[PDB]
């Protein structure tokens, strides 16, 4: 009987980290997403300067928006995180224990 | 921190279809890992039971 | 077996997956497009 | 292209609502069993003395 | 964020429901064995008389 | 559980996204312009 | 001058009823719950 | 959860800050387009004289 | 196939059902008889 109840225990433990396991990818995911869709605003504007007849002033204003979209990429990488952890910032490796 | 552009870029489209794949491919990995949560739990839920 | 009631446990589990199922229905549903996460289709999402 | 990216990852919403509407049911069939099943111990009570 | 939230904190209705009816069976049950416990060493009292 | 319904906040969120979409189809609709706000194009308006 | 007071001063529109939704619900449980805290009072006077 | 809330309250707040950031960026944007306005017509002016 | 699938293991609802009623019947049933069980013994000692 004590056995399996501590199996029992840490099988429930492990059920919510588990859970909390999920929560971290989806909660990196929606980032990622959104910062999908500013790079696919970034090729539409790259596509556009290629335009021979854009005069320069043209070419700055394209860069004006290149260079936003580019300072939001970083801005969220830096910034998103997950109960502390900056997910998008420093390569890393995390362990959910489920046993 | 990011230095200061020197010239014009080269064949920037391709360099941005690379951003591209490792964007994808990094969500493509997210997907796999949640799969494979959900599977355990479901497993862990029917040998609580048992 | 006064105690604990494991017909009522195994019970519960029948209602989760209906509950997940129909989260994942409304979801497809609100949104429109079948792929709505990486955690669907992850060749979908790429092409 | 665009009727191809449709193809890949538009719905139906038909098969979408006839789906909802079994996911509704089997859910209130479960409430409902369940609470039938709370009771089934009960029947022991009455041994009680 | 609401959603890691409510899987940490939130109560599970499905599951506090069962336990509930477990309890107060068990209680019902307490006190009638608790009762009948006293009652019968009196009947000995009785026959130590 | 009671205290959060996750789905009515997920459609909370699409809805409000395809709403954003039919705004911005109308106004150009209506106006016959698809320039209507600095936001749409930086260059279209300069030249 | 109208769409910044409407955001600043408006209520969503739809988060409203399903707040209204949660608390409905838990007005009826806690009632049932309240119930429930008189049976054990009276399991007790039984037990007397 | 202490944690979960700070969070998603502040992200709620700041959600209407940036509401409000894009106010002003419009309001700044239709006094510009007036001005632009004014500065084409000073130009046909200018070219007739 | 997929209506075949459901001829093989879907569960016919309404069969289940009185197949519930019946049993629940018998649950009672056995409940009170082996009520009186205790008893006869019980009148046993009574005699006693």
Same mark, same amino acid.
């Given at each position: 009987?004590?056995?399996?109840?501590?199996?029992?225990?840490?099988?429930?433990?492990?059920?919510?980290?588990?859970?909390?396991?999920?929560?971290?990818?989806?909660?990196?995911?929606?980032?990622?997403?959104?910062?999908?869709?500013?790079?696919?605003?970034?090729?539409?504007?790259?596509?556009?300067?290629?335009?021979?007849?854009?005069?320069?002033?043209?070419?700055?204003?394209?860069?004006?928006?290149?260079?936003?979209?580019?300072?939001?990429?970083?801005?969220?990488?830096?910034?998103?995180?997950?109960?502390?952890?900056?997910?998008?910032?420093?390569?890393?490796?995390?362990?959910?224990?489920?046993? | 921190?990011?230095?200061?552009?020197?010239?014009?870029?080269?064949?920037?489209?391709?360099?941005? !279809?690379?951003?591209?794949?490792?964007? !994808?491919?990094?969500?493509? !990995?997210?997907?796999?890992?949640?799969?494979?949560?959900?599977?355990?739990?479901?497993?862990?839920?029917?040998?609580?039971?048992? | 077996?006064?105690?604990?009631?494991?017909?009522?446990?195994?019970?519960?589990?029948?209602?989760?997956?209906?509950?997940?199922?129909?989260?994942?229905?409304?979801?497809?549903?609100?949104?429109?497009?079948?792929?709505?996460?990486?955690? @669907? @289709?992850?060749?979908?999402?790429?092409? | 292209?665009?009727?191809?990216?449709?193809?890949?990852?538009?719905?139906?919403?038909?098969?979408?609502?006839?789906?909802?509407?079994?996911?509704?049911?089997?859910?209130?069939?479960?409430?409902?069993?369940?609470?039938?099943?709370?009771?089934?111990?009960?029947?022991?009570?009455?041994?009680?003395?």
């Amino acid at each position: 009987a004590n056995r399996f109840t501590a199996n029992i225990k840490g099988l429930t433990q492990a059920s919510r980290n588990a859970n909390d396991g999920i929560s971290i990818a989806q909660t990196t995911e929606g980032a990622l997403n959104e910062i999908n869709n500013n790079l696919q605003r970034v090729r539409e504007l790259a596509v556009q300067s290629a335009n021979s007849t854009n005069s320069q002033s043209d070419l700055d204003s394209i860069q004006a928006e290149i260079t936003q979209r580019l300072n939001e990429i970083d801005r969220v990488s830096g910034q998103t995180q997950f109960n502390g952890v900056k997910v998008l910032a420093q390569d890393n490796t995390l362990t959910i224990q489920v046993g | 921190l990011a230095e200061a552009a020197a010239t014009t870029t080269e064949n920037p489209l391709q360099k941005i !279809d690379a951003a591209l794949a490792q964007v !994808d491919t990094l969500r493509s !990995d997210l997907g796999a890992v949640q799969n494979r949560f959900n599977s355990a739990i479901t497993n862990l839920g029917n040998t609580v039971n048992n | 077996v006064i105690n604990t009631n494991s017909l009522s446990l195994l019970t519960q589990n029948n209602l989760n997956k209906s509950q997940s199922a129909l989260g994942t229905a409304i979801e497809r549903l609100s949104s429109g497009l079948r792929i709505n996460s990486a955690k @669907d @289709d992850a060749a979908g999402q790429a092409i | 292209l665009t009727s191809a990216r449709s193809r890949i990852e538009d719905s139906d919403y038909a098969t979408e609502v006839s789906n909802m509407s079994r996911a509704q049911i089997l859910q209130q069939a479960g409430t409902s069993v369940l609470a039938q099943a709370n009771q089934v111990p009960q029947n022991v009570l009455s041994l009680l003395r």
